Nucleic acid binder design. Sequence first.
RNA 1: CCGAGCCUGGUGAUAGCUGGUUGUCCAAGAUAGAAUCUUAGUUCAACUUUAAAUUUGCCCACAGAACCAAAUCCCCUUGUAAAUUUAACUGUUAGUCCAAAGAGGAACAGCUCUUUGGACACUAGGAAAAAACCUUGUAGAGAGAGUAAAAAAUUUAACACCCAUAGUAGGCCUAAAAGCAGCCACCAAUUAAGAAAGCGUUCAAGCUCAACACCAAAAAUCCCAAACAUAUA
RNA 2: GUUAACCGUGCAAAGGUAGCAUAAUCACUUGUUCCUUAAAUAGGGACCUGUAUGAAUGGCUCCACGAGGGUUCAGCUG
RNA 3: ACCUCGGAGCAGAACCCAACCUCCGAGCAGUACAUGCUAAGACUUCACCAGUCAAAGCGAACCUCAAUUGAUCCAAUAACUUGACCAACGGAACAAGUUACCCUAGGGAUAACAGCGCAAUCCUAUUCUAGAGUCCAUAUCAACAAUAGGGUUUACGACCUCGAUGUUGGAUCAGGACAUCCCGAUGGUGCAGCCGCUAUUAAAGGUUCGUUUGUUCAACGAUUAAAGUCCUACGUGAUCUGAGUUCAGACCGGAGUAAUCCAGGUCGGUUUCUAUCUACUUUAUUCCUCCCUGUACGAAAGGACAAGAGAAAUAAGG
RNA 4: CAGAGUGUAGCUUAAAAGCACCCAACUUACACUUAGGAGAUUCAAUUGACGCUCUGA
Lengths: 205, 95, 64, 120, 107
Amino acid sequence: KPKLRFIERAPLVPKVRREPKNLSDIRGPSTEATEFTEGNFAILALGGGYLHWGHFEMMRLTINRSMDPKNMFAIWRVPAPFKPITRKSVGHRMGGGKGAIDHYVTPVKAGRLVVEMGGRCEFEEVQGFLDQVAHKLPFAAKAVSRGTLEKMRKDQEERERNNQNPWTFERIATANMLGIRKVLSPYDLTHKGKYWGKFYMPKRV
Amino acid sequence: YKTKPTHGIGKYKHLIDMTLAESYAQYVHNLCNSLSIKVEESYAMPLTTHERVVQISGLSATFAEIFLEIIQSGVRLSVXXXXXXXXXXXXXXXX
Amino acid sequence: RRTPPLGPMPNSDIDLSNLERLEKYRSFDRYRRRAEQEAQAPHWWRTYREYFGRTQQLLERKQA
Amino acid sequence: KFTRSRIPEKVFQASPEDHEKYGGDPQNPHKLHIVTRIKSTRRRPYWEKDIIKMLGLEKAHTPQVHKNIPSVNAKLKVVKHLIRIKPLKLPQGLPAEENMSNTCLKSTGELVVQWHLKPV
Amino acid sequence: LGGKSSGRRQGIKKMEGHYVHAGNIIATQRHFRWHPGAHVGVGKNKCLYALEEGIVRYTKEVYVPHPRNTEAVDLITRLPKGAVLYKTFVHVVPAKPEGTFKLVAML
RNA sequence: CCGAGCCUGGUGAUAGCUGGUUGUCCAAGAUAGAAUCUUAGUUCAACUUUAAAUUUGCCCACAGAACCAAAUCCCCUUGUAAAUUUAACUGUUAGUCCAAAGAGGAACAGCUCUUUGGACACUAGGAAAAAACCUUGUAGAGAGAGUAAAAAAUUUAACACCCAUAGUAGGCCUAAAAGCAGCCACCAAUUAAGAAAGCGUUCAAGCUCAACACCAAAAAUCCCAAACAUAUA
RNA sequence: GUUAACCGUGCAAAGGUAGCAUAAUCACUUGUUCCUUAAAUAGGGACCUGUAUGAAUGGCUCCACGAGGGUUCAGCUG
RNA sequence: ACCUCGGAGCAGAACCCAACCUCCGAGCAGUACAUGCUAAGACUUCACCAGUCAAAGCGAACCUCAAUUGAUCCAAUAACUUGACCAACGGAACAAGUUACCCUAGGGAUAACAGCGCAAUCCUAUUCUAGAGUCCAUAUCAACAAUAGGGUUUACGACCUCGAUGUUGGAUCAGGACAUCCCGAUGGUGCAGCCGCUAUUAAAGGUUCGUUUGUUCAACGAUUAAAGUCCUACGUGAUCUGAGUUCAGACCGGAGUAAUCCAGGUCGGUUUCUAUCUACUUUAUUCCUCCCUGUACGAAAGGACAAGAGAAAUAAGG
RNA sequence: CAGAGUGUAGCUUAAAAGCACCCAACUUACACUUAGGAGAUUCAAUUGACGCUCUGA
Ligand SMILES: [Mg+2]
Ligand SMILES: [Mg+2]
Ligand SMILES: [Mg+2]
Ligand SMILES: [Mg+2]
Ligand SMILES: [Mg+2]
Ligand SMILES: [Mg+2]
Ligand SMILES: [Mg+2]
Ligand SMILES: [Mg+2]
Ligand SMILES: [Mg+2]
Ligand SMILES: [Mg+2]
Ligand SMILES: [Mg+2]
Ligand SMILES: [Mg+2]
Ligand SMILES: [Mg+2]
Ligand SMILES: [Mg+2]
Ligand SMILES: [Mg+2]
Ligand SMILES: [Mg+2]
Ligand SMILES: [Mg+2]
Ligand SMILES: [Mg+2]
Ligand SMILES: [Mg+2]
Ligand SMILES: [Mg+2]
């Protein structure tokens, strides 16, 4: 059964507990689903964001429509929408408790592989629809092969090594020079430069 | 303290006729204990008749075979179904 | 800040992959003995002690 | 939350390249520091304000002489971004009781005793 | 709705190396974040206090529960055959000696 | 000037409310929390002032501060000079933005609510004008001097040319479904051309392709310094 | 239950009777239709889920009267 | 809705820390009856009051539980002792409505109008190619989504004004934007022609009169070339109206024991200013008729543009 | 029947030990506990000769 399965809105056994919006689950690099697990191609999330059910549905549909069925398969590597979003009744004033759970969403960070594809491949064929899917998604995304990813990583490494600018960000941060840690976050030692919010800056290093 | 090298020293959670039949059951249990197998449970099931059980889980074929042989070497047995003879006994497995 | 332990931590070797295979001290006495042994041993983390603290003959005997 | 920042100790270790770049030697390290306040305490945390005052670095561009030792260096590290530090290097011998009056810090941090305003 | 309870102000009142007189409370807690060690008592709150003049010290000592206290015993039994629990203990290390013989008179 | 007249007296009624509080000069001087018919106030605390007595005060370094990140506490040396107590008090106890960690709200607000740190309510220079961003604090005169912060950068979508015969209107399936309605197989003739990758055919046909040969913007009075690519950091 | 005479059943003290009714009568509400206008969220006449009508809190007719409030034929007039 | 007390998260590592933030609970039980006396030394819910722990000693043996509670004066008691859902829980010994008949002190520290921020909602444009369009994603529609922009809406916020700034409509006069309703100039067409649909450019000029209606709106009647969308304190009350509507009188329905109320209905209901200062106070469009012509175009039905001539209309100036 | 590793009772950086093990009682049974039980340097002066494991024939 090679095709994207149904990712249904909400969990069946729902959660009555209203989760307080920890936006940290968007921010930063993805701890979890970074490296390939038996798909050869993927959709790499370059920026963080909350994936809605609609988005998921779209991704399911499009891929299915353009899926070489006997040749190819497609995996889900983001879990199902599990983070509840609460919204107050329309136009009410501030206060009077928290809003009611309206829907559910999936947190995704930069580095997360949203979808995987594998099978007998045509690079062009995969890229076409995967790129479309990426574009459709609510963050900056990239249709990415294994080899391509590796190349990118290598390039990044080279950049890190190369730069003739004597001052890196990391050095400035950890060594505290200027009173600059007063401006910076405590997460700008872990992420260094690169990550500003949900966003990510591949070029700078 | 967290930041001290003696961090999780206290950590513990991660570490954590009838008469004859009965006798036979006991013996079986003892044997199981000796040979390092999980004895889950034992029952007291209802002329007269009397049944006893020794629930067992997890044992490799060769070892299992050996165990069976030892059991064989009175009353009766019932677990492939492996019955034998010399009230009642029934050592149900779960290999 | 997470510092690594200076020497080897206690309870490292015995946790293993599986818990259900081991013997466990079903008694208290054994546990007590183990504790005593541990106490007797030195450790790196200060700790209590830092702050406060023929054959023929045999044969004959056997015969007797 | 903004906090009192603790610096990793690898930051304060001179490489051979570093040595080459600057003047100092790893053996026979300089005894004293000329510490000058080059940047205002205003707009910095109160602990940094305190540190400057403890070092006596109240007038900017007016320099103080501090022992080079772990204790003094810890304070100096706290306000390193407010101060310029340079080794007190005495080309002639350090001031005796006869030469206490005639001295001159100069630029290039050197103390001098033979201070005559006439040229060579 | 619900409750808004005040902060409980519990925790350590005296740290390692502090000079602590007999009676001084050392650390207050709910449950045992620290346990009583040498010359240190326990009040009904589980609060730890000094039983003698001296210096506070903290140590990680092997923990054996009382046989009569059941739950601890059970836990111990559960552990694997080379495991030892360990727990933190607070001691007072006494300074001034209890006694000095003085000369009353020559009789 | 009747929701209860007018005058005199009690009556200088009472106001946690508003307004106002008059010579000079200097100095120290800012909003942790409590309760409270209480949040327009108050009284304790906290901070603040003075006069005393005093010995330590801040910076802090190894050790140390459960289990179920940033940091902090404790803290000897050390750099410094003050902090604790006693004696008298008043006044603040309706705060703002910026950075950071969070919470509510729209991952809205010059929005609301905590915490850590700045700044402002106190001069100056800058950021056009500017409270809160940055540089900078202890004072006065000079028709002296060195500096700090401090002046935004860009400009972007061409692309191939030629040549295309056959077993073959593969079969199975289809009324018919011929490289291309959907499956199975995807074999092969000459140099070389997929049992066919887009169109297109009612089905055929014709077009190609693969293969040989050739080599970023759009608002409501009227744009908004003037301008300038080139003599040496 | 059978728009329902009628049936079954409950509660009540009595269970809104005559009349009148989109009204000076919570809303729905430009209710629906006939008349009036070239054209009518106006006016008149009918109908009735008025779920919020109604009997000296007076209900319903109707003669005269009214600087009361609505609609209008004709004429007339900056 | 809540108002006292406790536990968990926010508040991840000494305490402390809010919200009409998120979640659990309590206002008791059970065992004793040395839950006897006293007492060094501490902690403390950021004050005080209340709470907590407690060595030794003297008397005796050989407490559990998280929260499980409440001051003073007064009562009741021979005395020991015991008295509140004083639950608004630091408690006034005992207290309700209503006020468009209202008054006073204040407040932009707190709303309605207006502005301002934001932009949820709303409006627009791209991207994307799902799907409609006998076939054919892009003549024309357009799903899921993505990226921008606007500030018409209803909100939200409470930053200026409560020693007032006059609030819906309408008249008068209009300045502006264009995101073009009309009149030009083009590109596509599922454009033969006539009529269309869509796209670029264009803001000179223009953008009807009535019935109803408080009204914007809306419907209908007649027109038209068109009968634009908006902004300007919902443009404009020291230029006007006051029909609504922000008061005093009154009814009908309802709510209320009643005074009296209703984001219910209906009749009535005073709109003041002599201008100090700024500002300012003489610089062509379009429709239709005729001809072309009943020609082009089309199989027929119908049916054109351009060039030309004539009449009108409005606007400006005499 | 020729070589190599050796050779404390099940097992040990034990030196006659401690762990293991057995019986009875309590235990449905297991487990715990309480009573009891049994066991060893293969043998002659660091050397030799009996016992295994292993590899050859
Ligand atoms: Mg007065
Ligand atoms: Mg001063
Ligand atoms: Mg604010
Ligand atoms: Mg505010
Ligand atoms: Mg009505
Ligand atoms: Mg009329
Ligand atoms: Mg009657
Ligand atoms: Mg009359
Ligand atoms: Mg206190
Ligand atoms: Mg005692
Ligand atoms: Mg009235
Ligand atoms: Mg009245
Ligand atoms: Mg007034
Ligand atoms: Mg205000
Ligand atoms: Mg104000
Ligand atoms: Mg289609
Ligand atoms: Mg335009
Ligand atoms: Mg007027
Ligand atoms: Mg006006
Ligand atoms: Mg009148």
